[PDB]
Amino acid sequence: ADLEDNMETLNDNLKVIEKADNAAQVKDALTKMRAAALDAQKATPPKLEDKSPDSPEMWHFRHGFDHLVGHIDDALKLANEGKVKEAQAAAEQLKCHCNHCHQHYR
Amino acid sequence: ADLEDNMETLNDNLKVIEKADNAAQVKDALTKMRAAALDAQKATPPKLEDKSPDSPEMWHFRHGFDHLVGHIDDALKLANEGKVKEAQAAAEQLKCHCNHCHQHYR
Ligand code: HEC
Ligand code: HEC
Ligand SMILES: [Co+2]
Numbered sequence: 001a002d003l004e005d006n007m008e009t010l011n012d013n014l015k016v017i018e019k020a021d022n023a024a025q026v027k028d029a030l031t032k033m034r035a036a037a038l039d040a041q042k043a044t045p046p047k048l049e050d051k052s053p054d055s056p057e058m059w060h061f062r063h064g065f066d067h068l069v070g071h072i073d074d075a076l077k078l079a080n081e082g083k084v085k086e087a088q089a090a091a092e093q094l095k096c097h098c099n100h101c102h103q104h105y106r
Numbered sequence: 107a108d109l110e111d112n113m114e115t116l117n118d119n120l121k122v123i124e125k126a127d128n129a130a131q132v133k134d135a136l137t138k139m140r141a142a143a144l145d146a147q148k149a150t151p152p153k154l155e156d157k158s159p160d161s162p163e164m165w166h167f168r169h170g171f172d173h174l175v176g177h178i179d180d181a182l183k184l185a186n187e188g189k190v191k192e193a194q195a196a197a198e199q200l201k202c203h204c205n206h207c208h209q210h211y212r
């Protein structure tokens with residue numbers, strides 16, 4: 001999977017979680033989101049290829065993925081507790097992470 | 107001023123930006139939010155009263171204010187460039203910073 005494929009996985013599985021009503025469905029989708037975020041986590045994106053890996057911009061970009069993974073992990077723990085609706089609300093709050101990184105990079 | 111005071115300041119002024127009757131109110135409210143955020147960064151939230159100042163919890167709490175301030179500064183630059191509608195639009199996305207830290211520690 002490349003960056004575009006990883007982002008489509010994140011996009012679609014957010015909606016899977018919204019559509020769901022049980023813990024197994026939400027867990028399955030969050031697990032898919034976690035793998036997609038981890039797949040995209042380490043690559044330097046094209047607009048930052050000329051920046052140093054420790055540059056402020058690259059640091060903030062990598063932190064965007066690390067922080068997204070952290071909150072996916074937290075939502076997954078809620079799903080593993082059978083707390084379906086709390087896990088769904090946590091998943092909805094992931095959208096803040098998506099929009100924050102997009103706004104920086106675009 | 108204490109943490110509750112600082113949060114009232116942030117809440118009132120975020121709404122001032124949403125409702126600003128004139129463009130100049132936006133920069134004035136961002137200025138007050140910046141100071142409130144830097145003050146709140148020096149407090150201990152009640153739910154973390156039993157945590158070390160070096161705990162990952164207090165680290166993430168303090169970092170959230172640095173990041174909020176960074177995005178307040180972006181909005182201030184827009185308003186100082188006279189791009190006051192862009193600044194108001196940016197201020198809207200500050201709500202994600204509030205929701206994120208609250209999810210953890212409010
Ligand atoms: C940086 C730390 C990012 C995070 C977190 C998320 N995305 Fe992303 N996204 C990022 C890049 C560099 C790109 C490619 C360049 C571009 O601006 O398109 C993308 C692209 C997408 C896309 C495709 C285009 C679009 O419709 O916006 C989608 C659908 C997308 N991203 C979705 C998405 C979601 C749902 C995220 C959070 C759950 C998310 N992205 C996080 C960088 C980063
Ligand atoms: C952490 C980095 C935070 C950020 C960023 C914001 N807030 Fe917050 N807020 C935080 C905590 C730990 C608490 C609990 C404080 C307590 O003493 O219990 C709060 C609380 C509030 C409140 C309620 C205040 C009260 O009197 O109980 C409000 C209205 C509030 N916060 C508003 C607010 C807004 C609008 C923010 C974004 C602009 C924001 N806060 C950021 C921690 C953090
Ligand atoms: Co967090």
Ligand SMILES: [Co+2]
Pocket residue numbers: 060100104173176177
């Ligand atoms: Co940022």
